[PDB]
């Protein structure tokens, strides 16, 4: 029981603790900005470094 289902249940319960239920305007703006900037950085990393 603990190894097969409780692992996924605990992972969900723990990752949900780091997510806000109701979206904030600042949260959404920061998320969009971070998405764009980090996607550009990661894509450039593969092109030049990775």
């Amino acid at each position: 029981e603990y190894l097969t289902k409780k692992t996924i249940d605990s992972f969900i319960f723990n990752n949900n603790r780091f997510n806000f239920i109701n979206l904030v305007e600042s949260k959404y703006f920061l998320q969009i900005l971070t998405l764009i900037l980090y996607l550009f950085f990661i894509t450039i990393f593969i092109l030049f470094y990775i």
Partner: protein, 360 residues
């Protein structure tokens, strides 16, 4: 042209113009339906009542009839595949079939919506007019031949969506008698409006930047010529600056994901679905899935296929990030509208993965 103007340059747009004119005349006539002066030499059989609640069933039926007439006109259409109106419109068999399918789906959804409206009149004439106007221009997106026309049509569609969202009733008839001397501050409509407006602004800025950058690259924003030039670059190696191409592709993909509300940018769509009527949610899903999602898929498959060597990595990374971030969120919803939005997001992510596979 300067000398002669061929009929085929606007023959397709002629039925659209007729439909727009009819819709505008009807809507304008509905705006003065209550102003009926009675002369001193005329008799009123019954006392006139100025409190009128006209069911939008009439507008729905009129829009459905107009869509059926447009479908009939498309059924009798014949000609040769070429570019129309100074290469700003693409008239292909595939585009015509896509327009026909979109129109059929819109007609079925409109019939269902009218049937639901006959049950309870919870929607006003303005929402029906906004839906009709959105349906008037929605089919035109399939005929786009250049990114400028596509951007203009998408901006128009976004404006129509915002207008439809503004047409939502703020107050409803309820038996809640305890709240008669107290104020309940509901911020759902304001939140939906703010989120839609900010997302639309950001997406429009990204799409405009992408178009401006693409024009400088090749000198044209058309569909076929851009792909030809991009494939030629892979064979002539004239422009080896892969950084600029990667940036343009990233901008286009980010703009498309933001407009479609693709993960990991999903809290915006989650909040959007949480504060709208059921019919409005149905209409928004039908518009986004049938038009926006299929357009993005065709852009990644048929329009920008020459750059698919670059879109693959971005698409894979986005899909992996969405699968990793949305799984944890997908198990904590406590609203039916949130559940519907999450189902739509999951379907969009699955379709994105399917398109990534298809591009191979």
């Amino acid at each position: 042209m300067l000398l002669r103007l061929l009929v085929s340059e606007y023959i397709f747009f002629l039925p659209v113009f007729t439909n727009l004119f009819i819709y505008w005349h009807i809507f304008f006539k509905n705006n003065i339906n209550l102003v009926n002066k009675k002369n001193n030499w005329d008799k009123s059989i019954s006392v006139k009542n100025i409190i009128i609640k006209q069911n939008p069933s009439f507008i729905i039926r009129l829009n459905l009839l107009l869509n059926s007439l447009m479908v009939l006109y498309l059924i009798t259409f014949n000609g040769y595949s070429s570019t129309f109106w100074w290469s700003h419109f693409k008239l292909n068999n595939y585009s015509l079939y896509m327009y026909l399918l979109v129109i059929i789906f819109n007609n079925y959804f409109l019939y269902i919506t009218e049937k639901h409206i006959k049950i309870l009149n919870n929607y006003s004439i303005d929402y029906f007019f906004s839906i009709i106007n959105i349906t008037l221009f929605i089919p035109m997106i399939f005929l786009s031949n250049t990114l400028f026309t596509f951007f203009f049509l998408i901006e128009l569609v976004s404006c129509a969506i915002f207008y439809k969202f503004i047409v939502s009733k703020i107050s409803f008839k309820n038996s809640n008698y305890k709240d008669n001397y107290f104020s309940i501050f509901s911020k759902n409509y304001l939140n939906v409006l703010f989120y839609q407006y900010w997302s639309s602004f950001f997406s429009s800025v990204m799409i405009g930047f992408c178009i401006i950058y693409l024009f400088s690259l090749t000198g044209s924003t058309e569909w076929s010529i851009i792909n030809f030039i991009v494939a030629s670059n892979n064979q002539i190696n004239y422009y080896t600056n892969n950084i600029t191409l990667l940036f343009i592709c990233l901008t286009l993909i980010i703009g498309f994901i933001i407009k479609l509300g693709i993960a990991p940018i999903q809290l915006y769509k989650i909040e959007i679905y949480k504060g709208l009527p059921f019919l409005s949610i149905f209409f928004y899903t039908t518009f986004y899935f049938l038009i926006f999602f299929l357009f993005f898929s065709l852009l990644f498959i048929y329009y920008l296929s020459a750059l698919n060597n670059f879109f693959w990595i971005i698409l894979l990374i986005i899909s992996i990030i969405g699968i990793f971030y949305i799984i944890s969120i997908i198990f904590d919803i406590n609203l039916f509208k949130a559940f519907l939005a999450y189902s739509t997001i999951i379907n969009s992510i699955s379709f994105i993965l399917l398109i990534i596979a298809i591009i191979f």
